[PDB]
Symmetry: C3
Subunit: 606 residues, 3 copies
């Protein structure tokens, strides 16, 4: 049956090719300590430029060619070679054989390091073949292939003999560049360092390049050939064809598309505390818990594009801050004040003062704006409690800023604590880590010390269909890891086989097994509920709020009996050990690493 638990739409999890420019920054030293660094409270809005990730679509053009140095001995066959290589599809195969025809020859005539080389299909000659959707062309902006074969050259022994195979790959994919637009990403796992807007039109070819004009072939008037149709489409596209050393990329060309007003605010933070310390303005935000330790001077509208737009932005920002929380809570201090953290972090900072000691407006005004870049006839200031309450201001400055430092280092340790927590979190499930941190459905994975970022093909909780056959026995009795599922993009989507992943993840896996431990009784997150299989067969579903339908309740003292039946045996059934027998998943690992210790010992005399 198709999925019914509509309380949570599924996640497609194909391995992503991240960038990644978003990673957990290394935690920070904890901030400054005792008194006056003229700790100054105020609302800052911190900005950077817009990175303008121009999006479009392109298509990849190459031909993977493989040769098998089969080793024909006496009666035996060593594959002394099965070598495969991507080889850039020529402009001509695109224009005619693909764009006009939609096919690719069973021979590939390709470049390889200044040497033109040909490859054929099965010790025989050329044949155009249709680009059926590639192997693993699903789950992505599709690709198209021709076969899934390997050929063995006709048998002649006592010599390394080579059998050939040629296949085409022409693939519609999505594409992302960014300002400063001298680069772009490729939706197969590739990147090219050339300016995205480089077509010969409008002078956008005068824009950056990092390559020569011997592989860029701009067909304006091109006809976008839908590779799901292998047939042309709507009014002519300007497809640029960059014949890379491995493929060709054809893409809609567009003008340079600059970005103004590019300055885009990181954050508004009212809890913006100034520490004039270490020859530096130390801006502490407890909203994001960062001390930008920047230069003293200010940052002008001149070092940015249209500083007036950001002036509007920040004025409205600070208004939203104050009016909502501080109608009668603080007093505006001076102007917003602009500070550059290297890497272009802009701080616009309207200092604020607490209503403590309300007698010091015009005066603490001056004293703390001091940092932007006998016989007598009484002549005291019109209320010497101006000066008196200034001395009291300095007094208060002492404990107030001391408290600020203390609570700020509290914030420091809190955030530095959780930083590594989230490191281990993305170690666990970076898909979920994204589905929270950006909050959206996503395909992710951990690339060592960096992550892989993407978004997956949509599947709601009605397109997937669990299988009930839950084992492979060619390897005698190997039950699959997580529910085998036939699913589809839409009702017209391709019903394709994979395994469920944890929390509605849809991995294409259809070999993901592990031994069939008797005693299998497993829930699995199924849409907005759970599937449940008993001993590798489907028992039943259960909605999330339908299993006891409460959260943190109960006692909860449930008992059980001891070492039990369900008996594959010689003594004291073993298949529950094959269900992690205490063990202690972690100790499961800690014991199975004791098995390497035996891979010898058929090879010794004493």
């Amino acid at each position: 049956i198709k999925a019914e638990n509509t309380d949570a739409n599924f996640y497609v999890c194909p391995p992503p090719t991240g960038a990644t420019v978003v990673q957990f920054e290394q935690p920070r030293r904890c901030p400054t300590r005792p008194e006056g660094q003229n700790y100054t409270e105020g609302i800052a809005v911190v900005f950077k430029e817009n990175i303008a990730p121009y999006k479009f679509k392109a298509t990849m053009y190459y031909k993977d060619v493989t040769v098998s140095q089969v080793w024909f001995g006496h009666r035996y066959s060593q594959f002394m070679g099965i070598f495969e290589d991507r080889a850039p599809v020529p402009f001509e195969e695109v224009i005619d054989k693909i764009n006009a025809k939609g096919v690719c020859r069973s021979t590939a005539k390709y470049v390889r390091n200044n040497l033109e080389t040909t490859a054929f299909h099965r010790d025989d000659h050329e044949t155009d073949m249709e680009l059926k959707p590639a192997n693993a062309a699903t789950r992505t902006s599709r690709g198209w292939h021709t076969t899934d074969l390997k050929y063995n050259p006709s048998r002649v022994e006592a010599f390394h003999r080579y059998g050939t195979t040629v296949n085409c790959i022409v693939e519609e994919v999505d594409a992302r560049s960014v300002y400063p637009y001298d680069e772009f990403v490729l939706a197969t796992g590739d990147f090219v360092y050339m300016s995205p807007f480089y077509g010969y039109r409008e002078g956008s070819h005068t824009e950056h390049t990092s390559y020569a004009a011997d592989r860029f072939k701009q067909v304006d008037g091109f006809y976008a050939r839908d590779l799901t149709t292998k047939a042309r489409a709507t009014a002519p596209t300007t497809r640029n064809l960059l014949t890379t050393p491995k493929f060709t990329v054809a893409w809609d060309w567009v003008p340079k598309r600059p970005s103004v007003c590019t300055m885009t605010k990181w954050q508004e933070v009212d809890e913006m505390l100034r520490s004039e310390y270490g020859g530096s303005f130390r801006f502490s935000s407890d909203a994001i818990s960062t001390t930008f330790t920047t230069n003293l001077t200010e940052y002008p509208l001149s070092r940015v594009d249209l500083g007036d737009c950001i002036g509007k932005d920040a004025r409205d920002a600070m208004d939203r801050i104050f009016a909502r929380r501080y109608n009668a809570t603080h007093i505006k201090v001076g102007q917003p004040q602009y500070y550059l953290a290297n890497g272009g972090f802009l701080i616009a900072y309207q200092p604020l003062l607490s209503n403590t000691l309300a007698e010091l407006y015009v005066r603490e005004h001056l004293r703390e704006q001091s940092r932007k870049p006998s016989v007598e006839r009484i002549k005291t200031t019109s209320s010497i409690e101006f000066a008196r309450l200034q001395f009291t201001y300095n007094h208060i400055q002492r404990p107030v800023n001391d408290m600020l430092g203390r609570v700020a280092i509290a914030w420091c340790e809190l955030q530095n604590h959780e930083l590594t927590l989230w490191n281990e979190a993305r170690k666990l499930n970076p898909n979920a880590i994204a589905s929270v941190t950006v909050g959206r459905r996503v395909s992710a994975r951990m690339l060592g010390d960096v992550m892989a970022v993407s978004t997956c093909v949509p599947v709601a909780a009605d397109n997937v269909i669990v299988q009930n056959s839950m084992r492979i026995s060619s390897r005698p009795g190997a039950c699959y890891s997580r529910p085998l599922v036939s699913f589809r993009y839409e009702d017209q989507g391709p019903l394709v086989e994979g395994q469920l992943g944890e929390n509605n993840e849809l991995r294409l896996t259809r070999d993901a097994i592990e031994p069939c431990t008797v005693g299998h009784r497993r829930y699995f997150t199924f849409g907005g509920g759970y599937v449940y299989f008993e001993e590798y067969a489907y028992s039943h579903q259960l909605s999330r709020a339908d299993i006891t339908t409460v959260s943190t309740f109960i006692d909860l003292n449930i008992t059980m009996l001891e070492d039990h039946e369900f008996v594959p045996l010689e003594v004291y059934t073993r298949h529950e050990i094959k269900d992690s027998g205490l063990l202690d998943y972690t100790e499961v690992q800690r014991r199975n690493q004791l098995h390497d210790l035996r891979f010898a010992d058929i090879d010794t005399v004493i």
Copy 2:
């Protein structure tokens, strides 16, 4: 052995064996974005639907058979069969051979392939065998076995030759029905699907039936032979005997045991705002962090039972909340309101009102009570401050509600972080995670994405005895991993063999070996103290205050111990590398997995 510091009793790792499958709420969806919804605050009290597990005792009965279809070669032999099957011990063997005799024949007689096959013991015929303790326990009325090994027939080659072995299995258990009492969980590992009050008397035919009338023999007034004494130690018991298709249950029969207050006060949350939104109200709890999107109308005391006791419980809860935090803090706003969060959460909610512009009593409750389910002259109202204060009501409500929304966003993101955290936390240690989230000392394990529960027995240390020398001698060089213990369920119980798990855990199995790591010096929590084994030999315990728990005059950061060369295997040996040195469990896995790379099973010509 009892330690110098033992206040932590010892919870000796009995993993669940079968039931149960307790479910766990998914991370609640994190909230929305901008303002107005009425957001009307006050106390909520959620009732749960009285669900309760009935508890009583039962006992299980089945003979298993093992057969050896040996094929004998010339002097060699293949086991063309070692087959083990289970057979419910029928009514009569319980009544006589068990209740009257406590003994079990050496033949097991059971249907198989639709044919009743008999099995003997040792190719020799029926013989009643003592129920010998299949284990040693103190909690769920443990059971008894009869044999350990299987038999092989004489040598007759070139034809499948068969030798037989029969075993009996009789084991008492605790039994846990659950409201609404139609099926019940067991202790051995099976689940039975009959009503608990089901039987033959007091209209128990109306009780949930899902089994035929040929296996259930309600032999009541029928003595239960205490087989921990192998003797009837009871009044003649109300036993019901279901010869289930795989086993036999004999259990106390009880009248129908329902209870009367259908809703049970499950939660209280003073942070209860009505977010008037989405064709609905959303009861938003910033104490247990929910937003139930319930209809505007309320669940009546009519469509659930006892609409008075529940209401009184809620009234008392609300009075408690008020008196505990609001003797003069908020305003009694309207009546409480009694909504069904789908699946059966009862939400009784007495609204509140802060003293923010406290000059709107008679009206504003009135106002929000909107949401439970020619010649001329001057005539002003009695105090148009009514209308002025209502204008202000709306206008301050707006940003107030926004602030509530945002603090709730913080609420949700935090809770959803923590959920995923606990996921891997229980995958590391479900014992600790569960046992503390519940308070009970229990043993849990992974059923895919949920937990299985079994309560551990807090024992004293002296029952448990870590031996001094630990190592496996299969091949020289493997000193056991976790502290081998001779322990006792009772004070004078059987000292049985297991291994100490982490921190009063006792992994019952003993196969966990490790490098006899030359320089191995490891503590393990022993009560409130720590046991020491230097190179897998016991020195001493140390209290946690002697191993120097958290300090401040240290950290200040004086240096500590460090390590240098030793004299196996030039510069120092591998014995310590394999002691999970560093390692770094993550590093442990990432390296040790490379043993596929450390695997070469191929020796051919190329």
Copy 3:
């Protein structure tokens, strides 16, 4: 390239051994909310005895010997032995061959099998050898060794054939006796008793000995020859020598080194509450997260040594606390009062009063110092209101105490929330755990249920070089997984081979290979930024001033590159699944076991 992202200093990975000095404690059950009470608000000041552990230098002396009992049969050669030992260099060879010469014979004369055996070099007679400094000439005090030499006995088959080799080792290192000074711990991973102040003079003889005076060799005016140069150094020094059973220690000797003032303020805790409960005072701090159950009376200046300095320090702590928060926040009542949180935690207290009923000072100081260790005249308290308010004070006591208890329980969870997780945090990150609790240091590890520490590492944090060789060919073509790095202890130190673990860490190992994931593009945490290799070829660094992290402005929610076919691909190419994903990372770890889970036997004729 040398380490240039040194916005984070780099740290080599040493082998840690710990106690630990700031040790993980276990979460605890937390007691009563409402009952036995009159919580005592006010400061406490916990003292803990500063032992002031002695830190100084020493030197280890031994000769590691090896004898190979090769097994020479027909023509083949098994090793019926490679026997490897440390023989303590005699105090004499230190005196002259090492301190006067710096040399030491190729032979060690030491007991084995209760037989004073000899060990020579290469089946020929004795010769002196030079102690060339090892890698242990750094990372502690200096150290000296010889090259990795081994000899195989002459060829005489059909008899156990024996060949010898002996290598000398002198290793000065850093040493830590800890007060109460009956002992001292070593830099090699060794402990010994017999307090190091065992010199004959100053009366230090009474200072603890655990070992007979047979091997205490006090040579005053005994310099330590610079063994990096075999030249006199360390102007003649009071060196005491213990020819331990494995080595000899030579260490500077000092007077007793007392530790007054021992008892030292652990912390000053503002929020402190006394629940006079369970026949005890329970001191609760939601200010430093503790719940001790301490003694009721006051630990006098007498029951511990020198308790006056403590009193001064506590006066200081208390006045600082008041001034920092309580100029007008609470009411002082009562003295400081001592309390023994057993295990050696002192608790001075200065009780407070909330400003609730600010009129009852004179009364309340009495009422709660009650718990330290007709013609009528209206005769009331000075104002009967005092007797009036004393009433509600009681009726204030419990509910307040209730809240006091109540909130604490919340705190309880929070505290009890995270303890074990920190333990699991190290399971990934002794790096992070140490760089937080230690602060900048690294290298902890898990010895059973205890932590292990090493804080000495001197690093040329500028000289760290990721190798541009990214493979091993032993397993033909195995790309190394973690960044191989040439580094050095000092700016001119030897660039030595190791592997760049995460975050400024250089493990001494280089074996971590992997199958070359085509398309490899990997950062690894490299100090002030990351290192990047592109398909196992150095791409570039990136400092952390330019690469994003989770924030608001332009999303930063988009998809990135997707994976597709590459050219190792028939189906499921190994090289790329290497990148920790198919999956379901945890299932990655699981299938990592699947390999033993399908094969250990090759053949058997059924």
